[PDB]
């Protein structure tokens, strides 16, 4: 857990050759202590201090661990820890070297690199995930899969596989 967070992303390519260095299972499975005993107590005590504080911490962790699942759902990446997108690296102005990034830069320094435009990227991603990709998929079924291919106007299929 977090075991190579200080490493560079090339030595934290090591982190995502393992389970993102166990980050997600440490997110949901560090609940196991307050999961093991909110109920082993058989005591009256007539009032509860943790009855609001532990509950607020618990549902805070749950909503935080669902917003990210919904955001991976909204970019077609649901289930997949590492997925790629149709959004290009745009005019976004931290254009730099590949062998600088994935060899000599930590994840935290990388967060300091692109601390701006992060909401720009998050707004940008679903655009290519949905507004044309879902509409192309909606086009792709309102034509018989094996009946159009005689016209010699087959590019539409080619167009949907290159652009």
């Amino acid at each position: 857990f977090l075991g190579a967070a200080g490493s560079t992303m090339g030595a934290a390519s090591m982190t995502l050759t393992v389970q993102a260095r166990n980050l997600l299972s440490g997110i949901v499975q560090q609940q196991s202590n307050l999961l093991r005993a909110p109920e082993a107590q058989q005591h009256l005590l007539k009032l509860t201090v943790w009855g609001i504080k532990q509950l607020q911490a618990r549902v805070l962790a749950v909503e935080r661990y669902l917003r990210d699942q919904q955001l991976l759902g909204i970019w077609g990446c649901s289930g997949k820890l590492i997925c790629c997108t149709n959004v290009p690296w745009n005019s976004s102005w931290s254009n730099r070297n590949l062998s600088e990034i994935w060899d000599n830069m930590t994840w935290l320094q990388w967060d300091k690199e692109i601390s701006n435009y992060t909401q720009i990227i998050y707004g940008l991603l679903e655009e290519s995930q949905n507004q044309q990709e879902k509409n192309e998929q909606d086009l792709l079924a309102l034509d018989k899969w094996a009946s159009l291919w005689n016209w010699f106007d087959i590019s539409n299929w080619l167009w949907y596989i290159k652009l």
Partner: protein
């Protein structure tokens, strides 16, 4: 911005071959359905089959088989039409076609029907050789007059009257295919019969296969 750069005109013989080009200046060219559609003068668009340049996908019109030669090139951004084994009925404007795009842009979903064109290329397939234009003026209650250009080969003749000044009554006709394969033209300038004596009325005919620019002042 799909713009199409063709090649220049040609005079040839039957049985030979002409490589006409369509360079795509701008526009996503490698993955879109080019077509090669020519038009004989005054008739339908004679489709000779298209090509997709992505995997050499040559949708062929089933009437010109064996005589067509269609390829593509991504580096020169140009599909090549090569009408081998020519005929004198190939005399046409060799337009190059390319399908459109939904939008709102020149990159989205294609639509099938052709949008963009080139400048148009002409072939004049005949075994008669290159000649120079010889004009012959008509002599002048009005009495119209012009200049009979003849003995030129191949097409076209570009007539001029007063270096383009008198622009009314210049009835510009297409050159009629005459009996011996020859062509003729007379932009018959209509003028009144009040100035038949002195005023300039010259027939300047230019013909770029010949490079002879004949000057001829009319006279009664």
């Amino acid at each position: 911005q799909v713009q199409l750069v063709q090649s220049g005109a040609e005079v040839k013989r039957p049985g030979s071959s002409v490589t006409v080009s369509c360079k795509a200046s701008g526009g996503s060219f490698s993955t879109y359905a080019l077509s090669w559609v020519r038009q004989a003068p005054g008739r339908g668009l004679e489709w000779m089959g298209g090509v997709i340049p992505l995997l050499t996908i040559t949708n062929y019109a089933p009437r010109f088989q064996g005589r067509i030669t269609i390829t593509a090139d991504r580096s020169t951004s140009t599909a090549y039409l090569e009408l081998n084994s020519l005929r004198p009925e190939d005399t046409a404007v060799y337009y190059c076609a390319r399908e459109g795009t939904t939008g709102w842009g020149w990159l989205g979903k294609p639509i099938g029907a052709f949008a963009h064109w080139g400048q148009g290329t002409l072939v004049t397939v005949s075994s008669a050789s290159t000649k120079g234009p010889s004009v012959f003026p008509l002599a002048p209650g009005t009495a119209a007059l012009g200049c009979l250009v003849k003995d030129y080969f191949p097409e076209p003749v570009t007539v001029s009257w007063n270096s383009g000044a008198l622009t009314s009554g210049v009835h510009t006709f297409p050159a009629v295919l005459q009996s011996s394969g020859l062509y003729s033209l007379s932009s018959v300038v209509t003028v009144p019969s009040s100035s038949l004596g002195t005023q300039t009325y010259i027939c300047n005919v230019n013909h770029k296969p010949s490079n002879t620019k004949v000057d001829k002042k009319v006279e009664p």
